[PDB]
Amino acid sequence: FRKMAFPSGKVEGCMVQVTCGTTTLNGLWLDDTVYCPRHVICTAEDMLNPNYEDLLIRKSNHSFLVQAGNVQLRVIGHSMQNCLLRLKVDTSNPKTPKYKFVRIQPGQTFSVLACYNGSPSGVYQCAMRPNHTIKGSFLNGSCGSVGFNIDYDCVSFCYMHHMELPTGVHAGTDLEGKFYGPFVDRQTAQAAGTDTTITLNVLAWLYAAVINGDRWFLNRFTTTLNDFNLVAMKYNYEPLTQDHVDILGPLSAQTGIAVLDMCAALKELLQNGMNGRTILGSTILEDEFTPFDVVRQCSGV
Amino acid sequence: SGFRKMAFPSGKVEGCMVQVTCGTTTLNGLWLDDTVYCPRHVICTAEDMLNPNYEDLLIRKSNHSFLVQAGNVQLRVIGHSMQNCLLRLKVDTSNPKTPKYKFVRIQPGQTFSVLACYNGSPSGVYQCAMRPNHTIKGSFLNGSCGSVGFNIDYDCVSFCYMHHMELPTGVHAGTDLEGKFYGPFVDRQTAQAAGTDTTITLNVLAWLYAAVINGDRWFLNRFTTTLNDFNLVAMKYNYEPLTQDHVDILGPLSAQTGIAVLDMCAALKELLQNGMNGRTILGSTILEDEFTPFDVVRQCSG
């Protein structure tokens, strides 16, 4: 059961390279606006304690060079929106797909189109961690790469990369320039807090297993929500809330397995392990597939 | 930082996918310039698939027998022909989204990206490796007949695989873009034994190098080994024999890291003999074999 990324073409046609002085990163070109991390105007030293409004004042439209493939896009306006720099260009992107900007919740997944200087390099699937960071792969020059989900013909952009954290983990913002987590675009001592396993997703994944005929772990018992959390939280799992139970409703109905009964199976797996067995071919409980990813991938259409 | 299984951006291939229908059978086709490529078994009903004679089946069709659609728009077929296990359909219009491309046949162990499609529409992309036994793992190849596998070098798409069959016993089988099957499989719905599979040693060693350039290093040790002695151990764990050619391939990664290939083989030998003791590497609890040395150099350098 592979984790798949969404087809990246629609986002590929929106990536450009933005350069301010000696700094270069990626930008997202939708209609006549290019969005990129505001720190593109910062040098490393400015990162110590930047006065963005002040730094942006000393910049003019000509301060930004925007390249779309072999084409230089003329910048005719700039401004800041939270942690994002917005650059108006004289040409509306002919490849602009139907889109939306959305702020994702911890635990939810999305695809990331890793780019290097405006040029798409690879695509992978990942999840927003409960601690608000993402475990990804961003080499030199990937800042500005974006995360997204596609629904039908609509691209829902939900993430833009800004920083690498001491852990080698990453931090960034939604497309309104608002950081996920307490993080900030400047050099501070900030670090990711302890993370937990995304219980909602592990349960989703166990439903996926059952849907695919791998069900040796099911049992004849059930559990109270509170009794489940009492055990699971001991194994560093996120507490399961009533809202999470409701979110698993469709999967519960499709399989005829009440959520608390699936919780009893999970409790047993955590307390007794798998005993050499595997689930969906895995020897480990997967936590980066959401209930929606399962429905999407098992109900295809 | 971080290390993820990464697929190539799929847009260049998305712009080439179409739907091909014959009678009541529909699957995906690849449209480049004025030609559409698809599995020849598009001409077969499920019953034909029990023991088809493609010659016989094909001579019974005409250009009008094929309905190809790009989205909801029909592309008129003006010619057809069979090339090994592929059906080639000439259409009256050219695909302006055709990228610079090449058709290549890869060797077992190599990786590529597959754009899973259904009825000619892009569904998802994933990275995989051609197993030593020529099958490919991925419950996701189900119903995606005609979906293709590829790698991208700069602006050039190197197509290397077309999905054809679901192998009763799991895994899927397919062909290169010349219509030649990978493996001892055939274009027919019969039980076909998939040879024994092995772990791709060359790739595991590349992945351990990845862990080292990424700061993992607990698995290293002070020993070394001869290639010969390494194989005597690895081959007991169902690992592919390692050759000097494979060791030479690891040279660059060895140069980076400053860890000799055979010393890394010595680390692996220990890993196979004493398991990982609950510890992890690059976040995984098992030795990963679907990243080639090239993949590693690509994701770890630039």
Helix (H) or strand (E) holding A111: strand A109-116
* Residue B269, φ and ψ in degrees, nearest 5: -55, -45
Task: Tell me how far apart the terminal alpha carbons of chain B are, to the nearest angstrom.
Answer: 12
Residues of chain B contacting residue A297, judged by C-beta atoms under 8 Å apart = 124, 140
Please tell me the class of the B3-14+100-197 domain.
mainly beta
Longest dimension (CA), chain B: 69
* Residue B228, φ and ψ in degrees, nearest 5: -55, -55
CA-to-CA separations, A277 to A285, B271, B274, B285, in angstroms, rounded: 12, 21, 20, 14
Is residue A165 classed as helix, strand or coil in its secondary structure? strand
What is the CATH topology of the domain spanning B198-301?
main proteinase (3clpro) structure, domain 3 (1.10.1840)
User: Could you tell me how many residues make up chain B?
Assistant: 302
Q: Which CATH architecture has domain A1-12+98-195?
A: Beta Barrel (2.40)
Please tell me the class of the A13-97 domain.
mainly beta
| Angle, helix A199-211 to helix A291-298, in steps of 10 degrees | 20
Cβ–Cβ contact B96 with A under 8 A: no
d(CA A291, CA A203): 8
Is residue A35 classed as helix, strand or coil in its secondary structure? strand
* Complete DSSP assignment for chain B: ------BPP-HHHHTTEEEEEETTEEEEEEEETTEEEEEGGGG--TTGGGS--HHHHHHT--GGG-EEEETTEEE-EEEEEEETTEEEEEESS--TTPPEEEE--PPTT-EEEEEEEETTEEEEEEEEE--TTS-B--GGGTT-TT-EEEEEETTEEEEEEEEEEE-TTS-EEEE-TTSPBSSS--SSSS--PPPP--B-HHHHHHHHHHHHHTT--TT--S----HHHHHHHHTTTTBPPP-HHHHHHTHHHHHTTT--HHHHHHHHHHHHHH--TT--BTTBSS---S--HHHHHHHHT-
Flag if A139 and B302 touch (Cβ within 8 Å).
yes
Nearest to B7 among A123, A138, A170 (CB): A123
Method: X-ray
Cβ–Cβ contact A69 with B under 8 A: no
In this structure, are residues B14 and A97 in contact, taking their beta carbons and an 8 Å threshold?
no
For tokens 């890869």, the residue is B106
Contacts of B260 (CB under 8 A, 6+ apart): B224, B254
What is the CATH topology of the domain spanning A196-299?
main proteinase (3clpro) structure, domain 3 (1.10.1840)
d(CA A212, CA A193): 35
Is residue A209 classed as helix, strand or coil in its secondary structure? helix
Read off the amino acid at residue B61.
K
Residue A147: name the closest of A157, A134, A136, A138 by CA. A157
Flag if B6 and A135 touch (Cβ within 8 Å).
no
Is residue A41 classed as helix, strand or coil in its secondary structure? helix
* Residue A55, φ and ψ in degrees, nearest 5: -65, -40
Cβ–Cβ contact A126 with B under 8 A: yes
Flag if A168 and B4 touch (Cβ within 8 Å).
no
Residues of chain B contacting residue A126, judged by C-beta atoms under 8 Å apart = 4
Residue B150: name the closest of B101, B195, B188 by CA. B101
| Angle, helix A225-232 to helix A259-272, in steps of 10 degrees | 30
As beta bridge partners, residue A173 has A160, A179
The domains of chain B are located at: 3-14+100-197, 15-99, 198-301
Is residue A81 classed as helix, strand or coil in its secondary structure? strand
In this structure, are residues A87 and A33 in contact, taking their beta carbons and an 8 Å threshold?
yes
Query: Tokens standing for A211?
Result: 């849907």
In this structure, are residues B67 and B21 in contact, taking their beta carbons and an 8 Å threshold?
yes
Contacts of B62 (CB under 8 A, 6+ apart): none
| Angle, helix B201-213 to helix B261-274, in steps of 10 degrees | 100
Residue B153's CB is within 10 A of a number of other CB atoms, namely 10
Residue A121's CB is within 10 A of a number of other CB atoms, namely 22
For tokens 């219009």, the residue is B93
Cβ–Cβ contact A137 with B under 8 A: yes
Cβ–Cβ contact A192 with B under 8 A: no
What CATH number labels B15-99?
2.40.10.10
Flag if B122 and A212 touch (Cβ within 8 Å).
no
| Angle, helix A259-272 to helix A199-211, in steps of 10 degrees | 100
Q: Is B34 exposed, middle or buried (0-12, 13-18, 19+ CB in 10 A)?
A: middle
The reply to whether A13-97 shares the fold of A1-12+98-195 is yes
Flag if A113 and B1 touch (Cβ within 8 Å).
no
d(CA A155, CA A180): 20
In this structure, are residues A117 and A48 in contact, taking their beta carbons and an 8 Å threshold?
no
Is residue A280 classed as helix, strand or coil in its secondary structure? coil
| Angle, helix B261-274 to helix B227-234, in steps of 10 degrees | 20
Return the sign of the alpha-carbon dihedral for residues A262, A263, A266, A267.
Answer: negative
Query: Tokens standing for B224?
Result: 């070394």
According to the 3-state scheme, what is the secondary structure of A49-79? CCCHHHHHHCCCHHHEEEEECCEEECEEEEE
A242–chain B nearest CA distance, Å:
31
* Residue A112, φ and ψ in degrees, nearest 5: -120, 130
* Residue A85, φ and ψ in degrees, nearest 5: -105, 135
Active site amino acids of B = 41, 145
Contacts of A237 (CB under 8 A, 6+ apart): A196, A197, A199, A202, A270
